[PDB]
Amino acid sequence: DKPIRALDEGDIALLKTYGQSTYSRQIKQVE
Amino acid sequence: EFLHAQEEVKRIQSIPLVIGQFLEAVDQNTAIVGSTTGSNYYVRILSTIDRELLKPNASVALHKHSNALVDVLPPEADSSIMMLTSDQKPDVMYADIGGMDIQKQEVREAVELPLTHFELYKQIGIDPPRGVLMYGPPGCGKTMLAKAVAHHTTAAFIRVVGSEFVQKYLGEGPRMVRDVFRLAKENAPAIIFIDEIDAIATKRFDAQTGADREVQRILLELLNQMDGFDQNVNVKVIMATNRADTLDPALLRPGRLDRKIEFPLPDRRQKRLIFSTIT
Amino acid sequence: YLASLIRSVVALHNLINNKIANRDAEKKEG
Amino acid sequence: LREELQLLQEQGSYVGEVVRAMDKKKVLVKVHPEGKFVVDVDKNIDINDVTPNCRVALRNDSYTLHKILPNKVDPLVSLMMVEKVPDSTYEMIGGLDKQIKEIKEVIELPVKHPELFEALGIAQPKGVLLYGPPGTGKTLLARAVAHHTDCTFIRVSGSELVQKFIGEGARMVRELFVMAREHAPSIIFMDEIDSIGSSRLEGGSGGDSEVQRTMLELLNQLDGFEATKNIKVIMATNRIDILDSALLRPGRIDRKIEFPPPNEEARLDILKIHSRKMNLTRGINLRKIAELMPGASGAEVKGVCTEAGMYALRERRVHVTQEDFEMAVAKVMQKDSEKNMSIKKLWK
Amino acid sequence: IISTHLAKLYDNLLEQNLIRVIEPFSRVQIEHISSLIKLSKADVERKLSQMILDKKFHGILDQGEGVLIIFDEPPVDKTYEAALETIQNMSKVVDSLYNKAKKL
Amino acid sequence: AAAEHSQRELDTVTLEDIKEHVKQLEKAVSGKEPRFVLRALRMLPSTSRRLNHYVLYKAVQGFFTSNNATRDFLLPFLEEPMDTEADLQFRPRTGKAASTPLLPEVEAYLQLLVVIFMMNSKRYKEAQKISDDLMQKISTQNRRALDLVAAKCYYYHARVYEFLDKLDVVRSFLHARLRTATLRHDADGQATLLNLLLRNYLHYSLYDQAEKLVSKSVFPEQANNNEWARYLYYTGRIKAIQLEYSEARRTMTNALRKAPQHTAVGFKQTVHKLLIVVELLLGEIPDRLQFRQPSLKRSLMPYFLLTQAVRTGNLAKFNQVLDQFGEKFQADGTYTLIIRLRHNVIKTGVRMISLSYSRISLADIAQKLQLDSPEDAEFIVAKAIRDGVIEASINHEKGYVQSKEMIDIYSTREPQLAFHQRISFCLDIHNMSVKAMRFPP
Amino acid sequence: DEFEEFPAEEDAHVWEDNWDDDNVEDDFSNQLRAELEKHGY
Amino acid sequence: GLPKNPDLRIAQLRFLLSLPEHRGDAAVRDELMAAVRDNNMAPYYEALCKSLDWQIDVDLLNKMKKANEDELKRLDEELEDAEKNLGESEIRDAMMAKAEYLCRIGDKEGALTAFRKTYDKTVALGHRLDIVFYLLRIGLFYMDNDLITRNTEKAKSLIEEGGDWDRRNRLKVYQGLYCVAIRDFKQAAELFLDTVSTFTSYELMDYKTFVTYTVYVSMIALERPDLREKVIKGAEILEVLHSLPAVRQYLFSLYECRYSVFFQSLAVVEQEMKKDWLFAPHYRYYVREMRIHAYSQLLESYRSLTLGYMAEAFGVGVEFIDQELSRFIAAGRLHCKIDKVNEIVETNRPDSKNWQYQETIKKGDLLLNRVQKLSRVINM
Ligand SMILES: Nc1ncnc2c1ncn2[C@@H]1O[C@H](COP(=O)(O)OP(=O)(O)O)[C@@H](O)[C@H]1O
Ligand SMILES: Nc1ncnc2c1ncn2[C@@H]1O[C@H](COP(=O)(O)OP(=O)(O)O)[C@@H](O)[C@H]1O
Ligand SMILES: [Mg+2]
Ligand SMILES: [Mg+2]
C-alpha cells in the first residue's frame, strides 16, 4: 500500500495553527 | 608555602584509612560513600583523585576521622564465580589435542583470532562472531578443546556448566547468567565457555509450571545477555551439546550462536592421531 | 635537554596565548 | 589548596532519608544504622523543598539538615538507565520503514508535539509491543530508538525483575517507574517479556506466583489508578500468544507491531545495509543472493554476510565473491530435517 | 617435496649446530668452526653471513683476518627513542602554534 | 567611469589603513610601549602600495593642516585632484586635535609615505628634497619611539641614494647617525644603520673598512630577523673575502635560515649564490635542491654548471663556464671567489678521497686526483690537512695517508657540549618568553 | 618586509634527483660486460 | 573490465621508436602501423610523423581522415537523434561514444574537451568514475603530469564519496603506475603489493608485466624482512614468476646473497628497463640504488672484508669494486671506509646510541630553529 509520509515541521506548525486558535492558546496558558 | 601545602595534601591520605563503598557522586569534590562501619556518609573528595576512577561500586579509602574520601583502592576483582586465574589454567595445549583440525580452525577463527588479529576483521568489516556451539557425541573433546582455548588465551576465561545455573530460589539462575556476563564485560576481553547446555537450552515450548517457567526464564536471560540491547563487545561465548537437534532456534540464531561446529566420533585418521598423542 | 625543550615550548605556547588574550581584550574594549 | 585542606578537616556528614516535614523548622529523617531523628534545618535550606523520601544530608554534630542531595535510587534500578547510548541507527534497519513509522507515531510524535493529540481530543498512545519471529530486529529497533530519542531510555531485560525474594520484583518495578517519572519524559524498553509477562497461571504449586505479582505491579504501574504522564513502554518479545491478555489489552499496550520475516526487497535492503563495509567484487548481484534466501530472519542475513567475510578471511583475501556469498548462504541456511522417514510418513 | 623439506631440515640443523658451537667462543676463526662442524670454509662463511644479516645470532665476521666476533646487542636505550618521539611531538606542537599566532 | 569610482574606493580604504596606522602611533605615544610602533612599520610595507597621487594629497590635507611649513613643503611635490563631486572631508583631527602640533611619529610616517610614493614614481630628485627635510626635522627629536620610525626612514634614505647612484655624499651622515643611535643605546636603529653602512661599503668595495667596523661595532641581538639576515649576509661576504671560509659558510647558512620564508626572492637568490660559492671553496658539494627550486632555478643555473664542472673534476668545463657565464658573476659580485675556486678545486677531490678511503697511498691519491707526481700529492694532502679540510696524517716513511681513527664520540665530551649549547638556548628562550608576558593594566 | 634593495633577478620533473644522476658514464650492462671479459681471461 | 582505449602498447611502441638504437627498428614500426590501421588513428599518425620526421602515406592518411570524418558525422547524428527523441541517458551515451572515438583516433585535446563536457553532463557516479578513469588513461598515454594528478585527485574524491572496491583497486593500480612514473618507488611498491592478488586492470598491462613491475619496485623499496615476507614468500608472485625465470632469478639472487648472478640479472633488468616506456628516466637511478643495496647488504654481515672477497662475490675486478665503493661512500650511501694499502673495507656502522644521538641532534636542531623563528616572530 501507500507508505505513510513523514510529518515535516511545516506540517506540524500548520496542524497546530490551522484550526481553533481564538481561545485555544489562552485556554491552555490559563490552565 | 605551596610545597608545604602539597605535603599536607599528601599527608591527608595517610595510614590508617577506612575502606568504604563509593555509593554515588553528588557533584565536584563531593560524594556519598558507604563505609564498612555500616553507615553511609556525605563526604568531600580530594582533588588529587581522578573523577573517572570513582565507579558507583568501586571501593574507596576514607580518612579515619573526617570520613572524607581520600583514595581509591585497586579493583579487587577476584575468582568471583570462576574467573580462571593464571594458576588455574587447565594446562592443556593444542599439542595435547590429537587431530581436531577443522574444529580447532573454526574455534581459533572465532575466539582466538579476533582477540589478536582484529585488523583483518576490520579490513573486511564483518563483525567477527560472538557465539559458537560444539555439538557431538559425548567424550569427543569439546570440553578439552575449551580447556586448550583457555590455556592459550590472552583474555579472561570463564568456565561454567549449564547445571550451576539451575538453582532453587527462582531468579538466581538468570541472576547468575547476568552476573557471569557482567563479569566478562568488566574483565574485557573475556571468553565464556558455557559447558554442557542441554539442560537449560531446550526448546521454549509452552510452559505451564513454575520449574518450566524458570528454566525458560534462564534461557531467555541467556538470549538477552548474549545478543540484546546492551552490546557486550570483546567477549565470546562457547557452548557444548550432545545432539543439537534440540535447543531453541533463538539460541541457534546466527546473531547469538554464529558458529555451530560438529565434533563427530574419531575415524581411522583422527583415531590414529589420538592414539599417537596419548601414547 | 629534552625537559628544557619541553619547558621552552610550553613557555612559548603560554606567551602566544597571553598575547592573543591581551589583544582580544584590547579589541573587545572598543 | 588551603581551602581544600580546611574543608577536608570538617567532619563528614551523615546522609538520611526524609519521612516528612513536621514544623517548617524540623524534619523527620531516618539515618542508615540508627532510627528516626527529628532534626533542625539549615538556614539556607527551605522547608518547602525537602519532600518525603529525598535523602538529605545531616551535620555530624546536631544532625542539622544542611543539604537536600539527590534522591535515593535502588542500586540495580539505576543500572537500568542507559547513559552511553548504543550505536544502532534507523539507517541500519532495512525493510521496516512502516514498522519504524508506526513505533515513532507513539515514541516520537506524542513527546515532541503533545499539542496535536490535545487538539485532536485523543489520548496519547502509551505501549508498543514489538512481536515477531526471532532475529527480525525488535531489540535492534529499540536500540535505534535509543540512539535517536533525546529522552530517557531506561532499559529492562525480561529477567532482571524476577529476584529470589517475595515482593522485591514488584518493588523494583515500582522504583523503575518512579525513576522514569522523575526523569520524564522517558521510554522503558522491556526485552524478552515472555519471562515476566507470560499467560497468568492459577494457584497450585505449578504457578510461579511471584512472577505474576511482579506482572500485576507492572501492569498497574503502566496503566492503573495513577495515570502515567510522558512515559512510553516499548516491549519486545516472541511468542505473542503466550503472554496474558491483561498487559495485551489496548489500554496497557496501544500498538502491537508485527515483525514478519523480511520479504525479498526487505532482504535486499538488509543485504545492502550489512555489506556497506565489505569490499564486494563486481558480479556480486545481491538480488540473486536474496533469491537464495527464501524467507530468512534478518539476523540470518547478517550471519550470511559474516560467513562470506569468514571465507574471504580464511582465503586471506579482502574481497568477497558471488560464489562465496551463495555458499555462505548455504551454510547459514542449514536446516535440520526429521531424518526419519518413519516419523515423516505418519502423516499421509 | 622430499628435496625441499630435507633441504629445509638440513639448513635448520646447520643453524642449530652453528649456534651450539658458538656459545663458548667470542672471536673464533671460521676455520675452527668449519673443522668442528665438518664442512667447507666457504659454506660456513656464507651461512654465518646469512644468519648475521637475518638478525639471527649477533656478531660480525672479520674477513680480513678470519673471525666472527660475538657481543651482547645493547638493548636500544628506550630513553633516547622516547626522546626522539617527544621531539617529533613538539615539532607537531610547534606547527600547531604556527597555525596559531596568525591572530597577531 | 566606474573604474575611477573603484579606484576612489580602494584609495579611501588606504586612507582608513593609514588612519589606523597613525592611531596606533598615537596609542604607542600615549601607552609607553614601542611595540605598537613596530606593528605600524610592519603594516607600512603593505600600504606602501595601493596608493596614488590623490591618496597622499588627501592624507596630507587630512592630517597636518596646521598651516605649518610642512604643508608648504609637501603639497607642491605632488599633484592635486580636481573639484570632485565626492568632496568627503577626511578630517581625523577635529579642533583641538588639529590645533596641537603633530607628534613626530605621525608626521614622520606621512612624510615617509611621501618619499616612498615619490620613489614609486621614479623621480628620485623630488624625493631627495623631502627626505632631506624629513631627516632635518627628525634629527633634533630625541623620542625613543621615533627612533623606530627613524630606523625605517633611515633605510629608505639610503635606498633613494641607491637610485641616485651616489652612496657617498651621505656616508659620513650615516656614520654620525649610527654613532648617535649607539649613544642612545637604540637597538633597531643601530642595527638597520649598520646594515645600510655595510651595504654601502660593499657597493664601493671597501671590504677592509667593513671588516674593521664589524670587528669594532657589535650587532644588537634584539633586532629584527630581517635586519639580522641582512647583517649575516654582509658578514658572510666579508668573511668569504677575508678567506675565513668556514665562518662565512656558517654565517650565510644562518642568514638563509633567517630569511623571510618566501618574501625576498632576490635576497635569497644572492644568499644562495654566495653560499654555494663559499661551500665549493670549502670543498663541500652543496644541496642539489637549491638548483631545482621554482624561484632559484634559472638564477643558480650557472652555479649549477659550475658545481657540476668542479664535482666532475673537469677543469676544462670550469674554464668554459667561466667564458660564457663567468661575466655574470661580475654582475653578481663573485668573480674573485670563482677564480679562487678555479685554483682551489683540488681541495674537493682531496676531501672526497679522505671521505671514501682511510689508508690510501700517496701514489693512488695522485692517480685519482690527476696529480702529475706523488710529491705534489704529498704537498697537496699536507696542505689540506693543515688547513682543516682533512683529518689524516701521512706516514712519510712508506707513503700512506692514514686518516684519524674515528673514536666513539658519545663516549667523549662532545655530546655534552652540544647538549649544553642546546640547553642554554632552550633556557634563554624560556626566559625571554616568560620575561615579557605582556600583562596589561 | 620584502627586501627590495636586492632585485629579484624543459626539465620540469617532479622527482628529487641526486647529484649522481648528473654524472655521465656508460650503462651498467656495458661496465659489467667489460669487467666480466677482463676477469674471464 | 574497462576498455583498452587508449592502448598503452601504442605509447610503448612510440617511445621505443623514439629511442636511438630502436629508431631504425622495423618490427616496432610494423606493429605500430598495424595498430594504427586497425584503429584508423589519423591525428596521432600526423603527430608521430612530425615527431619522427616520417614520410606520410597520402592515400592511407586521406582514407583515415575520411573514415574519421564520416564516423564523427555518424556520432553527431546519433547525438542529435537522442536529443530530439530520447532522454538525457541516450544523449549522454552518445557523447561518451563520441569522446571514446576521439580518444581512440588519437585526438588529445578533442578527447579531453569531449570527456570534460560529458563529465559536466554526467550524473551517475559510476559513469563519472569511468570518465575520470578514461582521462587518467589519456594522461598516462601522453605522460601529462598535471592531467594525471588532477584526475587522480578527482577519482580519489569520487571514491571517497562513493567507491566500489573494484574501482578503488583500479585506482590503486593507476596510482602505482604514476608513482613509478615519478620515481616515487615506495608508494608504487605499496600499491603494487596491495593490488597483485586482485589485479584486474588488464587494459594498462598484462599480468606478467604488472608482476615484473611489482617485483622491481618492491625490490628497490622494501627492506629485507618485508621483501622476504611479501615478495619472496608471495603466493601469486611466485606463481607468475614460475613462468618468468629471468625475473625470478633476479629477485632470488639478492635474497639468497648470490651477488654475481644478481649483478648479471641486474644488467639484464637495466637493459629491459631502458626500453620500457614508463621506467625510462629512472633506469640509471634504479641500477645505482640496486648496486648500493647489494653493497650495503653484503657489508651488513661483515666488519672488515678484503676487496678481493667482494670482487669474487660480485664476479668483478678489484678496481671496479673499489671505484664503485669509493663513489658510493663519497655520496654517503655506505657505512664503511677503504684501506687501499691492505685493500680492506672496514664498516663504520654507528651503534644504536650513536645513531640515536645523531638523530636527536638533527631533529632537535630543526625543532629549535622552528622555535627560534616562532619566538622571534611573536615577541616583536
Ligand atoms: N583428540 C583427542 N586427543 C587426545 N585425547 C582426547 C581426544 N579426544 C578426547 N580425548 C580424551 O577424552 C576426554 C574427553 O573429555 P571431554 O572433553 O569432557 O569430552 P566431551 O567434551 O565430549 O564430553 C579427554 O579427557 C581426553 O583425555
Ligand atoms: N531489518 C533489519 N536490517 C538490518 N539488520 C537487521 C534487521 N533485522 C534484524 N537485523 C539484525 O539482527 C540482529 C539482532 O536481531 P534482534 O533485534 O535481536 O532480533 P529479535 O529482537 O527478534 O531477537 C542485529 O545484529 C541486526 O543487524
Ligand atoms: Mg565434556
Ligand atoms: Mg532480540
Torsion of CA H227, H230, H235, H236, to 10 degrees: -90
Distance CA F333, CA F22 (A): 41
List the single residue in F426, F436, F437 with the smallest CB-CB distance to C4: F426
Query: Quick one: which atom of ligand 2 is closest to the CA of D92?
Result: 4
DSSP string, H152-168: HHHHHHHHHHS--HHHH
Say yes or no for a CB contact (<8 Å) between G7 and F266: yes
**Number of the ligand closest to the Cα of B139:** 1
Distance between CA F12 and CA D137 in Å, rounded? Answer: 68
- Which residue of B96, B144, B269, B277 sits with most ligand 1 atoms within 8 Å of its CB, as the best mutation to test the pocket? B144
> Cis peptide leading into F81, omega within 30 of 0?
no
CA nearest to D189, candidates D231, D239, D228: D231
| Probe site for chain A from D99, D116, D122, D257 (most A CB atoms < 10 A) | D116
Instruction: Compute the 3-state secondary structure of chain E and give helix, strand, coil in percent, each to the nearest 5.
Output: 60, 10, 35
Cβ H331–G18 below 8 Å, yes or no?
yes
Question: D333 CA distance to ligand 2 centroid (A)?
Answer: 16
Q: What are the grid coordinates assigned to D152, written together?
A: 530517557
Four-point Cα dihedral F387, F388, F389, F392, nearest 10: 100
Residue B139 is assigned to a ligand binding site: yes
CB H32 within 8 A of CB H14: yes
- Tell me how far apart the alpha carbons of residues A24 and D116 are, in angstroms, rounded to a whole number: 12
Of D99, D153, D108, the C-alpha closest to D129 is D99
Whether B60 and B240 have beta carbons less than 8 Å apart is answered as no
Q: Is B239 in the pocket of ligand 1 (CB under 6 A)?
A: no
For residue D115, give the C-alpha cell.
499539542
How far apart (Å, rounded) are the C-alpha atoms in residues E22 and E28? 8
* Vertex B194: Cα angle to B191 and B199 (nearest 5): 170
Residues H279, H284, H289, H295, Cα dihedral to 10° = 140
The DSSP H or E segment spanning B20 is strand B17-27
Residue of B42, B181, B200 to mutate for D, most D C-beta atoms under 10 A: B42
Q: How far away, in angstroms, is D127 Cα from ligand 2 center?
A: 21
User: What is the per-residue DSSP string for E17-35?
Assistant: HHHHTTSS-SS--HHHHHH
Query: Cis peptide before D125, with omega less than 30 degrees from 0?
Result: no
Q: Which residues of D touch H1 (CB under 8 A)?
A: 282
Cα G4 from Cα F226, distance rounded (Å) = 12
- DSSP, residue by residue, D58-120: E-TTT--EEE--PPP--TTTGGGS-SS-----GGG--S-HHHHHHHHHHHTHHHH-HHHHHHH
Residue D333 is given by DSSP the state T
Distances (CA, A) of D208 to B163, B200, B222, H180: 21, 18, 20, 76
Residues in chain B: 279
Residues H330 and B46: their CA atoms lie apart, in Å, by: 64
Q: Considering only alpha carbons, which residue of chain F is nearest residue G18? A: F288
What 3-state class would DSSP assign to B21? strand
CB atoms within 10 A of CB B28: 9
Q: Tell me phi and psi for residue H184, to 5 degrees.
A: -85, 80
Rounded to whole angstroms, the Cα distance separating B137 from B20 reads 51
Q: Collapse the DSSP code of H245 into the 3-class scheme (helix H, G, I; strand E, B; otherwise coil) and give the result.
A: helix
Rounded to 5°, the CA angle E90-E95-E101 comes to 115
Question: What is residue D324's three-state secondary structure?
Answer: helix
With an 8 Å Cβ cutoff, is D285 touching chain H? no
8 Å CB contact between B149 and B257? no
Say which DSSP state B200 is in: T
Chain centroid to Cα H204, Å, comes to: 11
Asked if H198 and D319 come within 8 Å (Cβ–Cβ), the reply is yes
User: For chain E, what is the total number of helices (H) and then of strands (E)?
Assistant: 4, 2
Residue C16: closest CA among H374, D232, F414, F360:
H374
Sign of CA dihedral F83, F84, F87, F90: negative
Q: What residue has cell string 614609486?
A: F120
Choose among F67, F63, F145: nearest CA to F104: F145
Rounded Cα–Cα distance for residues F235 and F275 (Å): 12
Nearest residue in D to A11, CA atom: D116
Q: CA nearest H255: which of E59, E50, E5? A: E50
User: Cα(D296) to centroid of ligand 2, in Å?
Assistant: 11
Asked whether the beta carbons of B18 and B37 are under 8 A apart, the reply is yes
Contact F350, F389 (CB under 8 A): yes
CA-nearest residue to D196 within chain B is B217
According to the entry, how was the structure determined? cryo-EM
Name the closest-CA residue to atom 7, ligand 1.
B141
Give yes or no for a contact between B193 and B159, defined as CB atoms under 8 angstroms apart: yes
CA G6 from centroid of its chain's CA atoms = 32
**Rounded Cα–Cα distance for residues H216 and H278 (Å):** 13
In one-letter notation, the amino acid at residue F397 is E
Cβ-count burial F48-65 (b if 16+ within 10 Å, e if not): beebbebbbbbbbbbbbe
C-alpha cell at H245: 625465470
Enter the C-alpha cell of residue F353: 678521497
Q: Beta-carbon neighbour count of residue F227 at 10 Å? A: 24
The reply to whether residue G18 touches residue F288, judged by beta carbons under 8 angstroms, is yes
Sheet holding B235-241, edge to edge: B156-160, B190-194, B235-241, B131-135, B259-262
Please tell me whether residue F29 adopts helix, strand or coil conformation: helix
Residue D92, Cβ density class (10 Å: 0-12 exposed, 13-18 middle, ≥19 buried)? middle
Considering only CB atoms, which chain H residues are within 8 Å of E43? none
CA F267 to ligand 3 center in whole angstroms: 85
The packing angle between helices H165-181 and H185-195, to 10°, is 150
- Cα dihedral sign, H372-H374-H375-H377: positive
What is the side-by-side strand order in the sheet with E59-62? E67-70, E59-62, H302-306, H344-347, H336-339
- For ligand 4, the distance from its centroid to the CA atom of residue B258, given in whole angstroms, is 15
Ion ligand 3 residues within 5 Å by Cβ: B 143
Q: Which of B252, B227, B225, B250 is nearest to B239 (CA)?
A: B252
For G30-40, b/e burial (b = at least 16 CB within 10 A) is ebbeebbeeee
Q: Is the peptide bond before H281 cis (omega within 30 degrees of 0)?
A: no
In the structure grid, which three cell numbers stand for residue F190, read together?
643601530
Is residue B197 within 6 Å of ligand 1 at its C-beta? no
CB contact at 8 A, H315 and H324: no
Amino acid at D126: K
Measured between alpha carbons, how far is D316 from B117 in angstroms, rounded to an integer? 12
Mutate to test the pocket of ligand 1, among B133, B140, B243 (most ligand atoms within 8 A of CB): B140
Distance, CA of H248 to chain centre: 20
Report how far residue D292's alpha carbon sits from residue D329's, in angstroms, rounded to the nearest whole number: 7
| DSSP codes of every residue in D129-186 | EEE-SSSSSHHHHHHHHHHS-SSB--EE-SSTT--SSTTHHHHHHHHHHHHHHHT-SE
φ, ψ of residue F31 to 5 degrees: the values are: -115, 0
Q: What cell numbers appear for B2 in the block?
A: 605551596
Judge whether D137 is annotated as a binding position: yes
Query: CB-based contacts of C5: which residues, under 8 Å, 6+ apart?
Result: E87, E90, F422, F426, H364, H367, H368, H371
Question: Is G6 within 8 Å of F266 when comparing Cβ atoms?
Answer: yes
Please report residues of D whose CB lies closer than 8 A to that of H168: 279
* Residues from G in contact with H at Cβ < 8 Å: 12-21, 27-29, 31-33, 35-36, 38-39
Strand partners, B22: B33
> Strands B156-160 and D186-191: what pairing?
unpaired
Cβ distance F357 to H326 less than 8 Å, yes or no, reads yes
Residue H94 CA to chain centroid, in angstroms? Answer: 33
Amino acid, single-letter form, for residue B208: Q
Relative to beta strand D13-21, strand B40-43 is antiparallel
Q: Is B137 annotated as a binding residue?
A: yes
F359–chain H nearest CA distance, Å = 5
D125 marked ligand binding residue: no
Structural domain boundaries of chain G? 1-39
- Ligand 2 atom closest to the CA of D262, numbered from 1: 1
- Beta-carbon count within 10 A of B278 CB: 8
Looking at the fold, whether F290 and F407 belong to one and the same domain comes out as no
Integer angstrom CA distances of residue F7 from A9, B119, F48, F61, F99: 49, 62, 16, 19, 32
Largest distance between two CA atoms of chain G: 70
Angle at D268 between CA D262 and CA D271, to 5 degrees: 100
List the alpha helices (DSSP H) in F188-224: 188-203, 207-216
Domain match, F306 and F408 both: no
Nearest to F226 among G1, G16, G23 (CB): G1
Report the separation in Å between the CA atom of H153 and the middle of ligand 2, taken as the mean of its atom positions: 39
Q: Which residue's C-alpha cell is 615617509?
A: F112
Length of chain F counted residue by residue: 441
Residue D128: φ, ψ to 5°: -125, 125
The one-letter amino acid at F175: H
Chain H residues whose beta carbon lies within 8 Å of the beta carbon of residue E74: 351-353
| Torsion sign (Cα): B128, B131, B135, B138 | positive
User: Does the beta carbon of H369 lie under 8 angstroms from any beta carbon of chain E?
Assistant: no
Cell numbers of H7, please? 592502448
Interface test with C, best of E77, E85, E92, E100 (most C CBs within 10 A): E100
Per-residue 3-state assignment (H helix, E strand, C coil) for D245-290: CCCCCCCCCCEEEECCCCCHHHHHHHHHHHCCCCEECCCCCHHHHH
Calpha distance D261→D293 (Å, rounded): 11
Residues F384, F350 contacting (CB under 8 angstroms): yes
The helix/strand/coil state of B191 is strand
| Residue in this structure with the C-alpha cell 654475481, named with its chain if needed | H260
User: E52 vs H300: CB contact, 8 Å cut-off?
Assistant: yes
Ligand 2 pocket mutation pick from D88, D96, D136, D258 by most atoms within 8 angstroms of CB: D136
Q: Are residues F412 and F302 in the same domain?
A: no
Q: Residue holding cell 605509447?
A: H11
Distance B176 CA to ligand 2 centre (A): 26
Pairing of strands H336-339, D155-156: unpaired
CA-to-CA distance for F375 and F378, rounded, in angstroms?
5
CB D216 within 8 A of CB D234: no
Residue H212 has a CB neighbour count (10 Å cut-off) of 24
Query: Based on C-alpha coordinates, what's the Rg of chain H?
Result: 26
Write out the DSSP string of B96-165: TS-S-HHHHHHHIIIIIHHHH-HHHHHHHT-----EEEEE-SSSSSHHHHHHHHHHT-SSEEEEE-TTTS
Contact D17, D72 (CB under 8 A): yes
In chain E, which residues have their Cβ closer than 8 Å to the Cβ of H352? 74-77
Same domain for F315 and F431: no
- B166, B221 in Cβ contact below 8 A? no
Q: Which atom of ligand 2 is nearest to the CA of D141?
A: 17
Distances (CA, A) of F105 to B109, F74, F112, F115, F131: 80, 17, 10, 15, 15
Half-sphere exposure of C8 (CA within 13 A, CB side): 29
Q: Work out the number of other CB atoms within 10 angstroms of the CB of residue B41.
A: 25
Instruction: Label the pairing between strands B190-194 and B156-160.
Output: parallel
Q: Identify which of H48, H72, H51 has the alpha carbon closest to the alpha carbon of residue H60.
A: H48
D135 is in an annotated binding site: yes
Residue B253's SS3 state is coil
* Cβ atoms within 10 Å, residue B125: 15
Supply the range of the domain harboring residue F418: 403-437
Closest ligand to the CA of B262: 1
Q: Which residues of D touch H166 (CB under 8 A)?
A: 281-282
A26 — phi, psi (to 5°)? Answer: -65, -40
**Interatomic CA distance for residues B202 and B218, integer angstroms:** 11
CB within 8 Å of F56: residues ≥ 6 apart? F78, F113, F114, F117
Among D96, D97, D140, residue to substitute to test ligand 2 (most atoms within 8 Å of Cβ): D140
Provide the number of CB pairs (under 8 Å) joining chain B to chain D.
Answer: 209
Longest dimension (CA), chain A: 44
Residue contact H360–E90, C-beta within 8 A? no
Cα–Cα distances (Å) from F390 to D163, F277, F379, H334, in that order, read 89, 20, 13, 20
Contact between D149 and D183 (Cβ < 8 Å): no
CB pairs under 8 A between F and H: 63
Find the farthest-apart pair of alpha carbons in chain B and give their distance in angstroms, rounded: 83
**Cα F192 from Cα F230, distance rounded (Å):** 9
